[PDB]
C-alpha cells in the first residue's frame, strides 16, 4: 500500500527505521580504540553443538590494516564487505597507497539509501564496526543502515549494546593500553552473553601500528580468558 521511499509525519524513512530495529536481532559486537591499536570482539551465538563454530565469521579482514565486525542480518553484510574490499584495492591500484579507515567507511555508506522503485528494494539490515590503522593512527568507525558513520573511542552494536555501552563508558580512558581494552571487552561480552563465554563461541581481532590485522587463534583466546 505504502512505498519504500515514504516519509513519516515525524520526518523519518520507515524502511530505515525498521532496518535499525533488525540490528537488535543481532549478536553483540564490541570495538575499542586505543593509542596502541584497535580491537574487535563479537559473540558468535552458537545455536547448535552440531554447527561448526569456525564457519561463523562476524569479524573479517578488509585489508591488511582494516578489520570489520558486523551485527544484524549477516547475509546482507557480505555485499557490503565485498564493496569495502574492492574499494581498498581500487584505491591502491590508482594511488599506490593505503586507503584510510574513514575513506573506506565513507565508500561503504554511499550504498545506503540507494534503494527504491532489479536494483536494491530495501536498505541493508546490518551495522558495521570498522577498525584499523592509518596515518592518523588507530581508528574505529560505526556505520548503521541509514548510512550515517562516525568515529568512536568505544562502541557496542547488537542486542545487548545499550548495556554494553554503559559498561564501556565506565571502563574506557584515552591513555588505556590495548591489552586492557582486550580484557575489558571480553569481560563485557561475558556479562551480556546468554551462554558461558569460552574460546569457541567468541571472535577477537586486533590491528596495531606494528602489525597487520590479526585474528586470534583458539590458543590465543584461551590465554586471554
Amino acid at each position: 500500500d505504502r512505498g519504500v521511499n515514504t516519509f513519516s509525519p515525524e520526518g523519518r524513512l520507515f524502511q530505515v527505521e525498521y532496518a535499525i530495529e533488525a540490528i537488535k536481532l543481532g549478536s553483540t559486537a564490541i570495538g575499542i580504540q586505543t593509542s596502541e591499536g584497535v580491537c574487535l570482539a563479537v559473540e558468535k551465538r552458537i545455536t547448535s553443538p552440531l554447527m561448526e563454530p569456525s564457519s561463523i565469521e562476524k569479524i573479517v579482514e578488509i585489508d591488511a590494516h582494516i578489520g570489520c565486525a558486523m551485527s544484524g542480518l549477516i547475509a546482507d553484510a557480505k555485499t557490503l564487505i565485498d564493496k569495502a574490499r574492492v574499494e581498498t584495492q581500487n584505491h591502491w591500484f590508482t594511488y599506490n597507497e593505503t586507503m584510510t579507515v574513514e575513506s573506506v567507511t565513507q565508500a561503504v555508506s554511499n550504498l545506503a539509501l540507494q534503494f527504491g522503485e532489479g536494483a536494491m528494494s530495501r536498505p541493508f539490515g546490518v551495522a558495521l564496526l570498522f577498525g584499523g590503522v592509518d596515518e592518523k593512527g588507530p581508528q574505529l568507525f560505526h556505520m548503521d543502515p541509514s548510512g550515517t558513520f562516525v568515529q568512536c573511542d568505544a562502541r557496542a552494536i547488537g542486542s545487548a549494546s545499550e548495556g554494553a555501552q554503559s559498561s564501556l563508558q565506565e571502563v574506557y580512558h584515552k591513555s588505556m593500553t590495548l591489552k586492557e581494552a582486550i580484557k575489558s571487552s571480553l569481560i563485557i561480552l561475558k556479562q551480556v552473553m546468554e551462554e558461558k563465554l569460552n574460546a569457541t563461541n567468541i571472535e577477537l581481532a586486533t590491528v596495531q601500528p606494528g602489525q597487520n590485522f590479526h585474528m586470534f587463534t583458539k590458543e590465543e583466546l584461551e590465554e586471554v580468558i
Binding site: 590508482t94 594511488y95 599506490n96 597507497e97 586507503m99 574513514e102 575513506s103
Partner: protein, 213 residues
C-alpha cells in the same frame, strides 16, 4: 584526411635533491617552422610540494592538466587530505592509460617532495609507463640534455671522482647551462627558461633569458 595531433615543441627537466626538487622548461610554443608565443610555460603547480612539466601536443597538455587539477580536488574532498607526489604519479599513470587507444601526445615529468621531505622526480611516456628518477630530461631537446646530466649528476664515465651530494647551487648552474646549450642546437628550445624550486618553504620561481632566434 584530418590529423588530431600536432607537435608544439618544448623541453622539460627535473632534478631531485636531498631536500629540494627542480622543474624547468623553456617558454617557446611552436608549430611547423613558426612560433606561436615566446611566453608559454610548460610547468604547472599541483600542490604546495608538487609541480608537473608537460610537453608535446599543446592541446593534450592543456586538457590533461585541467583533468589533473579536477582529480586533485576530488581526492581532497573524499580523502580529506592533499595528494602526495607519489599518489599523483600513480594516478597520472592510470589517466594516461585510459587513452591507450587514442593517446595523449604528451611527455610528463613530475617534480616535488616525497613524504620524508626528500626530492622526488617521476617521468612518464605518453601511455603512462613511469618510474622514479634522480634526474630526467623530457621533450624536444631531451637527447641533448640527458647525456650531460648522466655525466655531471650521475658521474657516469668518470674515474677518480668523489660522488658528492648535489647542492642546489650546482643544480641551478647545471639547469641553466644545459638549456643554453640546447638553445644553440634545438630549433624548438629558446626565448626564456622558467625554473621552479620546490622546498619545504614552498615553490619559488626564477626566469633566465634564452636566444630569441
Amino acid at each position: 584526411r584530418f590529423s588530431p595531433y600536432v607537435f608544439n615543441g618544448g623541453t622539460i627537466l627535473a632534478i631531485a635533491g636531498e631536500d629540494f626538487a627542480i622543474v624547468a622548461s623553456d617558454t617557446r610554443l611552436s608549430e611547423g617552422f613558426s612560433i606561436h608565443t615566446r611566453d608559454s610555460p610548460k610547468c604547472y603547480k599541483l600542490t604546495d610540494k608538487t609541480v608537473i612539466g608537460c610537453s608535446g601536443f599543446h592541446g593534450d597538455c592543456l586538457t590533461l592538466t585541467k583533468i589533473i587539477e579536477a582529480r586533485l580536488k576530488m581526492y581532497k574532498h573524499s580523502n580529506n587530505k592533499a595528494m602526495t607526489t607519489g599518489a599523483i604519479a600513480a594516478m597520472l599513470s592510470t589517466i594516461l592509460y585510459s587513452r591507450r587507444f587514442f593517446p595523449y601526445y604528451v611527455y610528463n615529468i613530475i617534480g616535488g617532495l616525497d613524504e620524508e621531505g626528500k626530492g622526488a622526480v617521476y617521468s612518464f611516456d605518453p601511455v603512462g609507463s613511469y618510474q622514479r628518477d634522480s634526474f630526467k630530461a623530457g621533450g624536444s631537446a631531451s637527447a641533448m640534455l640527458q647525456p650531460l646530466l648522466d655525466n655531471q649528476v650521475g658521474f657516469k664515465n668518470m674515474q677518480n671522482v668523489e660522488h658528492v651530494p648535489l647542492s642546489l647551487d650546482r643544480a641551478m648552474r647545471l639547469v641553466k647551462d644545459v638549456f643554453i646549450s640546447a638553445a644553440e642546437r634545438d630549433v624548438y628550445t629558446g626565448d626564456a627558461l622558467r625554473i621552479c624550486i620546490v622546498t619545504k618553504e614552498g615553490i619559488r620561481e626564477e626566469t633566465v633569458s634564452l636566444r630569441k632566434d
